[PDB]
Amino acid sequence: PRTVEEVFSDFRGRRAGLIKALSTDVQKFYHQCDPEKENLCLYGLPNETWEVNLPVEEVPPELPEPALGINFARDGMQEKDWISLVAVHSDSWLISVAFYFGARFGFGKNERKRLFQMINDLPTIFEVVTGNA
Amino acid sequence: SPRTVEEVFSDFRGRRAGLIKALSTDVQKFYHQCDPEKENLCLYGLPNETWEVNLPVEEVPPELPEPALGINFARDGMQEKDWISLVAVHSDSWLISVAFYFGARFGFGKNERKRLFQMINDLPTIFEVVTGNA
């Protein structure tokens, strides 16, 4: 069903916004992550934008939430290692969101397999930011 | 695959079994712990096949992905089996997040991620289990 492509399009859009935050806009992202601020995250939207403040959602929130408090360790390691750690959390979030949508759209086992194959043909954000893409 | 792939899958299967317990065998205990008079609660699965309903807190640093919060707010607004299904789908998305997070911390590459997904997707989702979709 063309619904696998719609869910994958959403995933690619959020992934593009997160890759922007962690590469092209890395210093903007870094400076918004002062380590004494509370509850910051990296949130990706399918229009290829990003934000560090958790958006207000319904209750329960419809989408899985990304990691909060990612800014505490910003100064405790090399910037590229902190970026890599944000990348790993971000990759685990994106796959959560995509499979949540797949379930909401009534994907069965075959649709779940097709969605994963498309996701896993792209380098992870971790691989992008570490130079292993 | 390296041994770590099966070890990450074993963690996944054990948490899944705990979540299946909460949403089936232990459903009334789970239901009553999802008290609508408490603050927003989450359902967690642990690798020893147990489950817990806890208020999420601001863990610093963040560790595992966080499950859906506020499941207790929706409990009385739906037929119980539809609320169970809602919790199940959120729990399925949490489990795959946890598994791929561990896989990343343990340096999985493309092939290791494929093998891990293959094993996860052999099993019916918790949503399928609780709705009779196998």
Cis ω for the linkage preceding B61 (within 30 of 0) = yes
How many angstroms separate the CA atoms of A38 and A88, rounded? 20
Q: Residue B26 burial by CB count (10 A; 0-12/13-18/19+): exposed, middle or buried?
A: middle
Mention every residue, 6+ apart, whose C-beta is less than 8 A from residue A106.
A3
DSSP class of residue B60 equals S
Angstrom distances, CA of residue A113 to CA of A78, A110, A119, B117, B121 = 37, 5, 10, 8, 7
How many angstroms separate the CA atoms of B94 and A64, rounded? 7
Among left, alpha and beta (phi > 0; psi -120 to 50; other), residue B67 is: beta
Tokens representing residue B1 in the block:
């695959």
Residue A72, chain B, CB below 8 Å: the answer is yes
Query: Nearest by CB to A103, which of B40, B110, B125?
Result: B125
Q: Which amino acid would we find at residue A116?
A: F
Angstrom distances, CA of residue A123 to CA of A13, A15, A26, A44, B108 = 14, 11, 19, 17, 12
Query: Nearest by CB to B114, which of A65, A120, A126?
Result: A120
How many angstroms separate the CA atoms of B91 and B67, rounded? 7
Backbone φ and ψ of B18, nearest 5°: -65, -40
State how far residue A101 is from chain B, nearest Cα, in angstroms.
9
Report resolution in angstroms.
1.4
CA neighbor of A22 nearest in space, from A133, A130, A132: A130
Provide the number of CB pairs (under 8 Å) joining chain A to chain B. 96
Q: Residue B120 burial by CB count (10 A; 0-12/13-18/19+): exposed, middle or buried?
A: buried
Which element (helix H / strand E) includes B53? strand B50-54
Is A46 in a helix, a strand, or coil? coil
Domain boundaries, chain B: 1-134
Q: Which amino acid would we find at residue B16?
A: R
A127-A131-A132 Cα angle (round to 5): 50
Tokens representing residue B120 in the block:
């996860």
> In chain A, positions 26-45, which contact chain B (CB-CB < 8 Å)?
38-39
